[PDB]
């Protein structure tokens, strides 16, 4: 089943949050392209963890969220951004802002959850 290739990378609860980009919050924002930063987000129901999310306006942003058995996603203003992917597979969305602004709220996530998942978290830096 878990055998990616073309697009979208599939992960596992094995050590995806213990080792790698999701392991430490320092690996959150990491430039991998000419003007595109790779953002990582993790949120599990087993304990507690920070939300070191970033999104510099003007440059491309590739958000990467992954969880063991919990949906996260995030709905940012400006556009009808619809990002929602079940746990067990890191997602990849391309959305860049034009101005600074802090937003952390979840809603209208396809199914329209509201009593399980968590509240998104994103921060823009000038």
UniProtKB/Swiss-Prot annotation:
It is a peripheral membrane protein. Keywords: Cell membrane, Copper, Electron transport, Membrane, Metal-binding, Respiratory chain, Translocase, Transmembrane, Transport. It catalyses: 4 Fe(II)-[cytochrome c] + O2 + 8 H(+)(in) = 4 Fe(III)-[cytochrome c] + 2 H2O + 4 H(+)(out). Subunits I and II form the functional core of the enzyme complex. Electrons originating in cytochrome c are transferred via heme a and Cu(A) to the binuclear center formed by heme a3 and Cu(B). Belongs to the cytochrome c oxidase subunit 2 family. PANTHER family: CYTOCHROME C OXIDASE SUBUNIT II (PTHR42838), NITROUS-OXIDE REDUCTASE (PTHR42838:SF2). This is Cytochrome c oxidase subunit 2. It comes from Thermus thermophilus. The lineage of its organism: Bacteria, Thermotogati, Deinococcota, Deinococci, Thermales. The gene is cbaB.
